[PDB]
Ligand binder design. Structure first.
Ligand code: HEM
Ligand code: JZ3
Ligand code: JZ3
Length: 293
């Protein structure tokens, strides 16, 4: 008997309230611009949204974004979550200013805000995640290993109810940020921009000259002469013929990648949540730039 998690709108809140939270996150992203050699907190916030959602299991509705369970020791100490404390620390003053927003709503909204502020697609977002108790925290080990092949990636993502297109689209988030040796045992950025959301991940996969090397942690990763890297799981997207077709598609159509990423990312963030028939429609937040702020 899977759990049922029903979205419940924070009492009396509407679009304007959530746009204010978005704005606070966005303003702080602009302000705190030295973090991680001037990449800023955008990428780590996207990773935090993904890891807080990616614990979901479709079979029994355990894990997922709803409960905001990353706030609990077992989950924030997950080896898979190493470094995400930076995203959590970033969000702390946001939580303090807006203590009415649920933890799940805040983690997921952090990811949406980061993507949009980094010039990515609009990501419609729905409120109503409700904090669940410590004993609802999923055990460690539900997040994916990076040292694996296409078969692993495909099978892994079936648990999150993602198909090939959704997987390939979601992986394009690797345009953002970088791997850090001390966090994950991998080192280097996937591309040049780091804090601009584009289809660069796919272009780099297809266009760079990759060499399978060992990093300083004795793990294999694919390295280019440009100083970029790909995880074995990234590289598997061009080894598998079905993934490869989709990589080529996104490398050659920026708009299509944006549309597909937006759908898959919202889906990821909403997995496991039952929205009542009379729940508000998804919100689409204006960027700071769109507001002249
Ligand atoms: C097979 C699936 C995936 C694997 C194995 C994987 C693995 C990793 C690893 C090892 C890192 C480096 C962590 C570090 O050293 O800081 C990383 C970073 C990152 N991941 Fe993925 N990931 C996967 C899918 C995703 C998805 C679906 C998203 C979001 C849509 C995502 C977003 C990010 C972002 C933005 C970073 C950079 C974080 C930063 O710069 O602080 N990843 N991932
Ligand atoms: C300076 O870093 C950022 C600014 C706005 C959005 C995301 C970032 O990483
Ligand atoms: C419950 O406190 C938090 C939740 C989500 C993000 C930052 C926080 O301080």
């Amino acid at each position: 008997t899977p759990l049922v998690h029903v979205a419940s709108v924070e009492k009396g809140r509407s679009y304007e309230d959530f746009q204010k939270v978005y704005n606070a996150i966005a303003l702080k992203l602009r302000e705190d611009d030295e973090y991680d050699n001037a990449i800023g907190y955008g990428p780590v916030l996207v990773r935090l949204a993904w890891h807080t959602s990616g614990t979901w299991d479709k079979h029994d509705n355990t894990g997922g974004s709803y409960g905001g369970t990353y706030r609990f020791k077992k989950e924030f100490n997950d080896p898979s979550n190493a470094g995400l404390q930076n995203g959590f620390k970033f969000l702390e003053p946001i939580h303090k200013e807006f203590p009415w927003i649920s933890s799940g709503d805040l983690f997921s909204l952090g990811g949406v805000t980061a993507v949009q502020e980094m010039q990515g697609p609009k990501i419609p977002w729905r409120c109503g995640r409700v904090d669940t108790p410590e004993d609802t925290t999923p055990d460690n080990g539900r997040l994916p290993d990076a040292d694996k092949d296409a078969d692993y990636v495909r099978t892994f993502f079936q648990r999150l109810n993602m198909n090939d297109r959704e997987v390939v689209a979601l992986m394009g988030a690797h345009a953002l940020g970088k791997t850090h040796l001390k966090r994950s045992g991998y080192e280097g950025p996937w591309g040049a921009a780091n804090n601009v959301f584009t289809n660069e991940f796919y272009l780099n996969l297809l266009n760079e000259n990759w060499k399978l090397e060992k990093n300083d942690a004795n793990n294999e990763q694919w390295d280019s002469k440009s100083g970029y890297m790909m995880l074995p799981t990234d590289y598997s997207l061009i080894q598998d013929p079905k993934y490869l077709s989709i990589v080529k598609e996104y490398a050659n159509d920026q708009d299509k990648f944006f549309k597909d990423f937006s759908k898959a990312f919202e889906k990821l963030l909403e997995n496991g949540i039952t929205f009542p028939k009379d729940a508000p429609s998804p919100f689409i937040f204006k960027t700071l730039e769109e507001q002249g702020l």
